[PDB]
Structure 1
Amino acid sequence: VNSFSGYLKLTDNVYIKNADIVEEAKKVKPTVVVNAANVYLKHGGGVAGALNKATNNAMQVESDDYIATNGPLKVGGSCVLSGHNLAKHCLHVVGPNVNKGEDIQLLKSAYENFNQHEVLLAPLLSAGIFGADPIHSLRVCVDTVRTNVYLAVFDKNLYDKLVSSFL
């Protein structure tokens, strides 16, 4: 049993809810929250900008030190950093950004990072301002992630379309 509440069960291991991932993280304090990161860990907008704002910019300060030491992530890659006030850990995962022309086949590689964690609170990778089709992102998630993933979807309209169209 875990603390997640109000989710619709899609599969053995994938759950979904219409929720603000920031408000959900603050309530649950999950072991892992996933950030929709870019390779520079520049948390300007979308999910990343909202998570970083909720940490009072401490996520960005920590991320700038990570990049200064290690250099940029790979598209499809990830790193584990602090969850600050939101979670124990933040898994920063880089899905491909269609608005930069990145290979959508890298979305499966991105979701494979989730398999290193038994339970996660996450957004749909490459959705929103990363430009991919969220229906596609949910299908790759279900077909790639084997650990228990609790997906938070920001737009109610999109949430209802994801559920209604789910095979």
Structure 2
Amino acid sequence: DLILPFYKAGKVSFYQGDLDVLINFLEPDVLVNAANGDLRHVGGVARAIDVFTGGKLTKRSKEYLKSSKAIAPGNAVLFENVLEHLSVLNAVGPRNGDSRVEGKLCNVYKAIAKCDGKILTPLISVGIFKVKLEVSLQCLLKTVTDRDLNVFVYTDQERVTIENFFNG
């Protein structure tokens, strides 16, 4: 077997590594994307997935927008099959220091919880959105109470920070 999780906690598995490669070998079904909610797809995740889908993501997005409402931090929306057997879920995390940063985040995990098949997803609202990893995790673990989930990060420091979460 090839890409192995570097930590495992309940049915959540944590992977480090590049995106395309993860998608490629982990073969998911739902790729959760971290999107800033009026839906320009910039930075490590989104600018990533968009490119991988040949930019279909963005094409569906402008489309989406004409007959549907911008996504409200604390909400996510699903684009079914942006590729064949590849669904992208557009998660809008809260910014740092809006209110119930807490609650909002958890709904996002909660909504993610809800999907079908293999999920690959990054940690919401971490990175540019400047929310502590501790929390996005804290929330993650709480919410997706029971289902297999595939979380990925990019950095080392990230990877580590996660390990010490479980060690203490």
What is the TM-score of this pair, normalised by structure 1? Answer: 0.87
Give me the whole-angstrom Cα distance separating, in 1, the residues matched to 2:75 and 2:2. Answer: 26
- Structure 1 residue ranges (4+ consecutive) displaced by more than 4 angstroms after TM superposition: none
Give me the whole-angstrom Cα distance separating, in 2, the residues matched to 1:37 and 1:4. Answer: 29
Q: How does 1:56-95 map to 2 (within 5 A)?
A: 56-85=54-83, 88-95=86-93
Alpha-carbon offset, residue 69 of structure 1: 1.4
Structure 1 residue matching 2:66: 3-state secondary structure: helix
Give me the whole-angstrom Cα distance separating, in 1, the residues matched to 2:53 and 2:153. Answer: 20
Structure 2 residue matching 1:108: 3-state secondary structure: helix
Alpha-carbon offset, residue 131 of structure 1: 0.7
Match for 1:121: what amino acid?
A: L
Q: 1:109 to 1:78 in 2, by over 3 A?
A: same
Contiguous gaps of at least 5 residues in structure 1: none
Equivalent residue for 1:13, pick from 11, 14, 19: 11
Contact 1:46 1:129 in 2 (8 A): no
The residue number in structure 1 matching 2:46 is 48
Match for 1:93: what amino acid?
A: A
Q: How does 1:30-41 map to 2 (within 5 A)?
A: 30-41=28-39
Contiguous gaps of at least 5 residues in structure 2: none
Alpha-carbon offset, residue 86 of structure 1: 8.5
Structure 1 residue matching 2:9: 3-state secondary structure: coil
Post-superposition Cα deviations, 1:6-63, rounded to whole Å, max 9, x if no partner, equal 0144322211111223321133331111000122121022311111122222110111
Corresponding residue pairs, total: 163
The residue number in structure 2 matching 1:102 is 98
Q: Alignment identity in percent?
A: 25
Contact 1:9 1:16 in 2 (8 A): yes
Contact 1:33 1:87 in 2 (8 A): no
